[PDB]
From a paper:
The necrosome comprises receptor-interacting serine/threonine-protein kinase 1 (RIPK1), RIPK3, and mixed lineage kinase domain-like protein (MLKL). , Active RIPK1 phosphorylates and activates RIPK3, which in turn phosphorylates MLKL. Formation of the necrosome involves RIPK1 autophosphorylation at multiple sites, followed by phosphorylation of RIPK3, and finally MLKL phosphorylation, which initiates pore formation and necroptosis. Necroptosis is a form of programmed cell death that, when dysregulated, is associated with cancer and inflammatory and neurodegenerative diseases. Here, we describe a multifaceted array of molecular, cellular, structural, and chemical biology approaches to characterize the 7PQ inhibitor series and identify RIPK1 as their target.
RIPK1 was purified and crystallized in the presence of Nec-1s followed by soaking with AZ’902 or AZ’320. Nec-1s is an allosteric inhibitor of RIPK1, and binding was observed at a hydrophobic pocket behind the ATP binding site, as previously described. In contrast, AZ’902 and AZ’320 both bound RIPK1 at identical sites around the hinge region, with the 7PQ motif interacting directly with RIPK1. A hydrogen bond interaction was identified between the 7PQ nitrogen and the backbone nitrogen of RIPK1 Met95, supporting the critical position of the nitrogen observed in the SAR studies and explaining the inactivity of compounds in which this nitrogen is varied. The compounds partially overlap with the predicted ATP binding site and thus likely act as Type I kinase inhibitors; as per literature, most inhibitors for RIPK1 are Type II or III. The RHS of the molecules is exposed to the solvent and does not form notable interactions with RIPK1, consistent with the observation that a range of motifs are tolerated in the para-position of the 7-phenyl ring. Furthermore, incubation with AZ’902 led to significant changes in HDX exchange at the hinge region around Met95 (residues 94–100), with the same trend observed for AZ’320. Given the precedence for inhibition of RIPK1 to prevent necroptosis, the possibility of direct RIPK1 inhibition was tested in a biochemical ADP-Glo kinase assay using the recombinant RIPK1 kinase domain. Both AZ’902 and Nec-1 inhibited RIPK1 kinase activity with comparable IC50s, confirming the 7PQ series as inhibitors of RIPK1. Nec-1s and AZ’902 acted synergistically specifically in the range of 0.06–0.25 μM Nec-1s and 0.78–3.13 μM AZ’902, using the HSA model in the Combenefit analysis package. Key structural motifs adjacent to the Nec-1s allosteric site, such as the DFG loop and C-α helix, are in the same inactive conformation observed when Nec-1s is bound to RIPK1 alone, suggesting that the mechanism of Nec-1s binding is unaffected by the 7PQ series.
Author numbering: 8 to 46, 56 to 168, 188 to 294
The structure:
């Protein structure tokens, strides 16, 4: 069961920039502290109850909902340092062992989501949020995984089977492709395809088998992680592993080489 909330429980607002997902709001619960707010009543609630069951340390929790006349808001836990891309482009830059942990925690969170039959469909640095200790949580701030709540750069992480084909149904392996490009971004410390001509041209190129430039990596990236990204951004969805497949290989690798 969901905490159904009221806006009289919130002191109020400090609308923050949410990384390309439009406006959100950092609002102060009068009893339970800081929270974030994204602003058919039984269909909504039914869904809100579905998503509120999503409970894992690497997944942003839906705390509850503000369904009042005019305003429909979802209420979620706050992550102080923002999205993964922002923290990477930060001046005091982040070491290799911490990047390894972020990767493993992204794997854990995604495995959980799948295990509860949720397909994210829109994984990307913007939906990977960070707290003060540099642990991460997966979010869905564009409501990609929703149906009724949805009704009420983007493309760089999308699997080629979805580029120019919006009728094909996302699979677990759609999320694996997005992971591959996140891996890339984690070591390049920027967005891929800097030199792109047009979206139309770039899309064709990606559907035909172009990927981010593994040479833009001015850091040391271990060669077993460059292998994993190439595995995970295979054109053919069937040739990509599952997140449990990735974890089983990457966790022993992490602890034994990255600690
Ligand atoms: C334009 C600019 O100069 N900047 C925006 C990004 C850069 C990062 N900052 C240090 S921050 O502004 O303090 C910050 C912003 C947004 C968030 C956030 C957003 C959306 C969230 C959804 C769910 C959970 N937590 C969230 C948390 C958390 C922290 C500062
Ligand atoms: C918008 N929103 C989140 O970011 N986290 C919560 C819970 C949630 C719903 N769908 C999710 C996906 Cl696909 C991943 C992580 C959290 C979630 C929520 O409602």
């Amino acid at each position: 069961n969901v905490i159904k909330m009221k806006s009289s429980d919130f002191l109020e607002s400090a609308e923050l920039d949410s990384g390309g997902f439009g406006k959100v709001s950092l609002a102060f619960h009068r009893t339970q502290g800081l929270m974030i707010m994204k602003t058919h009543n039984e269909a909504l609630l039914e869904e809100a109850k579905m998503m509120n069951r999503l409970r894992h340390s690497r997944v942003v929790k839906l705390l509850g909902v503000i369904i009042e006349e005019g305003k429909y808001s979802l209420v979620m836990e706050y992550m102080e340092k923002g999205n993964l891309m922002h923290v990477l482009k930060a001046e005091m830059s982040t070491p290799l062992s911490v990047k390894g942990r972020i990767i493993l925690e992204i794997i854990e969170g995604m495995a959980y989501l799948h295990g509860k039959g949720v397909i994210h469909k829109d994984l990307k640095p913007e939906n990977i949020l960070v707290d003060n200790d540099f642990h991460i949580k997966i979010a869905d701030l564009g409501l990609a995984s929703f149906k009724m709540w949805s009704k009420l750069g983007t493309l760089y992480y999308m699997a080629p089977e979805h580029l120019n084909d919006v009728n094909a149904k996302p699979t677990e392996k759609s999320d694996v492709y997005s992971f591959a490009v996140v891996l890339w971004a984690i070591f390049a410390n920027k967005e891929p395809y800097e030199n792109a001509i047009a979206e139309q041209q770039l899309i064709m190129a990606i559907k035909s088998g172009n990927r981010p430039d593994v040479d833009d990596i001015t850091e040391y990236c271990p060669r077993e992680i460059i292998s994993l990204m190439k595995l995970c951004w295979e054109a053919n969805p069937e040739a990509r592993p599952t997140f449990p497949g990735i974890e089983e290989k990457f966790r022993p690798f992490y602890l034994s080489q990255l600690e």
